[PDB]
Each structure stands twice: as C-alpha cells, then as structure tokens.
Amino acid sequence: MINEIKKNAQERMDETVEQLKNELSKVGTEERRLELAKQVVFAANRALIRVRTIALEAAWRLLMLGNKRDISQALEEIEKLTKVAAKKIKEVLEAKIKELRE
Amino acid sequence: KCKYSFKCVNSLKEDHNQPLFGVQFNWHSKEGDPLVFATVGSNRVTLYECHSQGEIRLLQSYVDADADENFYTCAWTYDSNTSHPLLAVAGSRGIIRIINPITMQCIKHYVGHGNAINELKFHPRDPNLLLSVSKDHALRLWNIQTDTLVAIFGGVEGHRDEVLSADYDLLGEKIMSCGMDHSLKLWRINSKRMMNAIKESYDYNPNFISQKIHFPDFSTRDIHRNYVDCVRWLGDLILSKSCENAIVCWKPGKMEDDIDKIKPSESNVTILGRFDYSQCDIWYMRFSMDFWQKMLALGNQVGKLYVWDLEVEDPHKAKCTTLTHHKCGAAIRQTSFSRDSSILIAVCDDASIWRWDRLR
C-alpha cells in the first residue's frame, strides 16, 4: 504494498509537473501571442490529464487489493496529492501565460 | 505528427448477424490479467478474451429473455465488496440490466421513464454511481448499491429535446451532456447539494426523493449547428461531434479561463481545433479514447477507422494512418482500446468484430 502505491504516484505526478515546467520553458503580434497562449493551455491540460490518470490508476490498484482502514487512508492521501499537483500545474500556467503578455 | 501504427490481426462475424452497437474493454483489471471486452447488439451480450497471435476467444454469451430487446450500450464497474467486475447493459426497452460476468446473470435492473437508453457511464471514483442517458429531455444518476435514483438533470433549463450523450470528467466532479437542441450542458456533481444527494442515497434504507436539477452550471449552442451525438472530456477541454464530419475540441469561456471558475451565465466559448474525417454523418456513431487519453478513435459508416494522436496540438498533424480492410465495409458503431492501448477493437452493422494490434 500500500506504501509503494502512494509513493510511486507521488513521484509520477511530480515527474509530470517537472516535465510541464520544462516543456513550457521551450515556449510577437496579438495573434502570435494568442497561438502561444493556446500552446501553453494545450500543454497544461496534458499535464492535468496525466496527474488525474495517475490518481485513477493508483486508486484502482488499491481498490483491487481487497486492512480497509489503511486502504481508504491510501485513496484519501492520493486524492489530496492530485489536488496539490493540479494547483501547481494551474499556477505554472497562470505564470507563463502572464509572462508571454508582459 | 502522429506516429501510431496498427495491423489488422483478426476478425469475426457473430452468428446472430445483427448490428453490434456497443463494445467496451474492461479497464478494471490488473496488469497481467486477460484482456476482456464486451459486445452488445440485438438482445445479446457477448464477452470475448484477446489472446496472442490475434486469437479472440468467446468467454460468455448472454441472451435476454425479452427477444424484443435491442441493446445499444454497455459499461463496466466492479462490486464494492468482492471487487469482481460488473457489466451494465441498456437499449431499446429502457431498462438498465446489471450482469454478473462470472455467472452471466442479470442481478439488478433499473427503469427510468421507460424510454430507450442512448448511453451508460460509471462514475470514475464511485463504482456504484451510474449515469444514464435516455431518449428524453433529462439524464439520470443511479446508485446501484442502494438501488436508488440520486438525481434528474433537466427540465426548466435542461435540454429542450432528447439528450443524446454525456460524459464525466476524469475525477467524476462534473458531467457534460449534449443533445438534439444543439446544446452542451455542464452539471457539477461536486457541489454541496450533489455530494449530499449521493450521501443520502447511500444512507437510505427500507428494511427515496431524488434531486431535481433544473439548471446547469454552463450551457452553449455555439459549438455545433446540428444535433450533438457524442461528447467526451479531454482534461478540462471538451471533444464533441455532430453530423458535419468533424470532432470539435473546445472549452467554456476564454482561452485562459479555469473550468472551475466558469459561471453559469458565461456566454463565451473558445474553439481550439477540429478533427476532420469523412463519411460518418449518420445517427449513433461514437468516438473513443485510450486510458491515458493519448489516442482518439472514430470508425465511419463505410468501415474506415480514423485514429488521431492527442499529444499533437494541431489536429491536422495528429491524423494517423486510417485503418482499412478490404472485407470491412460495414458501418463501425463503436471502437474500444485495451487498458494498455495495444489492442483496438471495432464493431460493425453486419455483426463483425475487427481487431487491430498496435505496431508502433
């Protein structure tokens, strides 16, 4: 394991954020800026997708391991990691999208 | 640019010779478990297992007593206690049947207004919450553990006509529905009201009053001009199609708007791209994606299977080599990816099943 499921997810989601933060560093008329803003939206969505699908796969793995006190504590912790990683992705988006305009 | 490549490894025609309307792989399985898929059509449910060298083995075959039943959709869940998978099936007779795949026994059943059922979806995080879309102005949320109707979505500001399709987001926090009236409607189910409705449905015991949600959290008619027959979430973005031979990628509000900050009164929409194709302008033609939402698939009315790489931004560049076979000329109603995205199954109007193994 229950410990490894929460651990493997914690790292997987953190490797997602790191890959977005760098993918974004690789990124002008009003039109050209809107195309770059779209590109950054596209990229952050792919990140939000990955984090949420890691959580789903972590959840199911645990659910397919049947304690009931530590297995419900496992999902509780994973769903909290997901909301943290999504917050961080939505803040890195809001930083880069304001940077392209400024 | 798309890199995905597939090979047709097998095909079979089911003995009943009726159209196959639905196909779904079971994703509620561990790595190493056998790859099982369900097909629905006529009054039949058939379970198949994918094996090496393109082998497609028949596991189970279910015949409904009601010979007048015409199954259109199916969806997988699992039993909260035992963890064994369960299959929900529905179609023309307006009845949801919950089949135990070990014994092929219909254990539970639910009836809404009684109209034919278009689509079934299970909640991503709560296996007991089943979303039903029927030939009606409203959509239903069921609790299959307590056998109760949790909520009804529609009415005063619901779809003005028949709801055609609906989908949950990845975490089951919201639903996006679409219908004949050209509109797409957001229904938030992570709200205090909906969380409480769910709780009370669980707390209910004989050894029930459903919530009537008359108003959505966002609505638009500015995406498609004709009826919207298929809708799916792509992260915080929406994929949706009509009869205009394209899947539209779009989002509520402006480019930079957070989906969870979107007000019900929001009048704006942003179109991000279009997945173009041809000859798929007929009724009930569904599109699907793999677990990781890396691939988008859509079969057409002449037996051609369009695939796109969802990691590619430009939909024009995302287009993968179209999957064709000389003996596959029947309309493809639905397609299903295996949990690992290695097998792609397509089902047709002539009762044929087509297996495409991913080469690259």
Side-chain angles (χ1 to χ4, degrees), chain A residues 4 9 13-14 16-17 20 22-25 27-29 31-33 35-37 39-41 43-49 51-55 57-59 62 66 74-75 81-82 84-86 89 91 93 95-96 99, chain B residues 2 4-6 8-12 14-16 18-28 32-51 53-67 69-77 79 81 85-92 94-112 114-124 126-133 136 138-155 158-159 161-181 183-191 193-198 200-204 206 208 210-211 213-220 222-224 226-253 255 257-260 262 264-265 269-275 277-293 295-303 305-315 318 320-326 328-338 340-359:
Chain A
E4 187 69 278
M13 273 168 198
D14 285 17
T16 302
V17 179
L20 169 66
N22 283 285
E23 198 105 68
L24 281 203
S25 74
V27 184
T29 58
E31 292 78 58
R32 172 73 167 123
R33 281 170 197 235
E35 295 319 308
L36 286 165
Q39 193 197 351
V40 172
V41 173
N45 197 59
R46 293 306 324 176
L48 286 183
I49 287 170
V51 159
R52 281 154 201 180
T53 39
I54 286 156
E57 200 184 66
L62 294 159
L75 312 165
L81 297 153
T82 307
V84 157
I89 284 151
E91 279 169 324
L93 165 64
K96 188 90 199 184
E99 184 192 297
Chain B
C2 178
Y4 307 119
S5 182
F6 301 82
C8 182
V9 288
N10 204 2
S11 107
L12 73 130
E14 293 196 348
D15 291 353
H16 67 109
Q18 299 302 289
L20 290 182
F21 285 105
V23 59
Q24 295 282 144
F25 267 95
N26 176 34
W27 289 356
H28 306 280
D33 295 5
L35 305 189
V36 176
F37 72 87
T39 66
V40 305
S42 193
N43 62 332
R44 282 142 182 270
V45 179
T46 316
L47 302 187
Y48 291 97
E49 206 168 71
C50 285
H51 292 264
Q53 295 79 40
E55 189 186 8
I56 305 159
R57 294 180 54 256
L58 196 149
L59 282 186
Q60 299 277 23
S61 218
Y62 174 86
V63 181
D64 201 289
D66 179 47
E69 184 55 285
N70 203 19
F71 296 118
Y72 299 137
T73 184
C74 68
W76 294 97
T77 189
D79 191 70
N81 292 278
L86 279 165
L87 182 80
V89 293
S92 73
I95 300 154
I96 291 146
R97 309 225 149 254
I98 312 288
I99 291 139
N100 179 309
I102 291 144
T103 54
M104 282 298 125
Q105 164 203 36
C106 187
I107 54 163
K108 277 153 174 176
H109 61 98
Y110 310 97
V111 206
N115 292 358
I117 293 164
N118 294 327
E119 184 94 278
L120 291 174
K121 296 293 184 129
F122 276 92
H123 185 293
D126 193 340
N128 310 135
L129 305 178
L130 174 72
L131 182 68
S132 40
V133 172
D136 198 58
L139 52 152
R140 279 153 198 82
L141 185 52
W142 298 84
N143 188 328
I144 77 160
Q145 179 191 125
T146 57
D147 307 294
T148 63
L149 166 56
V150 176
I152 305 128
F153 306 91
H159 292 269
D161 209 285
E162 194 174 296
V163 184
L164 299 190
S165 176
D167 196 52
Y168 289 102
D169 64 332
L170 275 163
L171 310 159
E173 270 161 27
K174 59 191 176 304
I175 292 147
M176 185 66 73
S177 69
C178 73
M180 292 207 180
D181 59 306
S183 85
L184 302 121
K185 301 195 193 288
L186 186 74
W187 310 93
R188 294 189 192 273
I189 56 156
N190 65 333
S191 61
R193 182 193 193 167
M194 271 307 300
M195 284 302 198
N196 180 257
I198 291 155
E200 69 185 27
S201 74
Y202 271 119
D203 292 350
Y204 170 85
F208 187 76
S210 318
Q211 283 305 311
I213 316 297
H214 299 303
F215 300 92
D217 293 288
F218 167 82
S219 178
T220 190
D222 280 34
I223 308 308
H224 305 279
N226 248 77
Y227 63 92
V228 196
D229 61 355
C230 194
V231 70
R232 281 266 219 140
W233 277 103
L234 188 62
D236 290 355
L237 311 174
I238 300 101
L239 301 170
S240 63
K241 68 176 274 298
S242 191
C243 59
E244 282 295 272
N245 280 317
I247 295 142
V248 183
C249 188
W250 63 279
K251 75 175 273 155
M255 194 59 87
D257 294 8
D258 173 24
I259 189 57
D260 289 322
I262 290 293
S265 57
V269 280
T270 309
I271 316 305
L272 291 159
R274 284 175 82 98
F275 296 91
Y277 54 93
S278 55
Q279 278 172 299
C280 186
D281 45 49
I282 62 160
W283 185 271
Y284 208 50
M285 300 284 278
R286 298 184 274 172
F287 69 83
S288 298
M289 314 183 272
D290 62 327
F291 185 59
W292 302 96
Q293 306 191 315
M295 281 160 276
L296 168 65
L298 180 66
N300 85 355
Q301 75 218 24
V302 282
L305 182 37
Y306 297 95
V307 183
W308 291 263
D309 185 356
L310 291 168
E311 290 201 294
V312 178
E313 203 167 300
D314 192 28
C320 313
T321 298
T322 299
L323 310 184
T324 60
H325 191 287
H326 59 255
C328 183
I332 299 167
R333 294 265 156 215
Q334 189 162 54
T335 54
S336 185
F337 289 89
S338 41
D340 57 17
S341 324
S342 67
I343 305 177
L344 171 54
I345 300 278
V347 297
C348 316
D349 278 347
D350 68 339
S352 66
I353 298 137
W354 296 83
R355 174 180 167 170
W356 297 88
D357 269 23
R358 190 139 78 86
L359 268 151

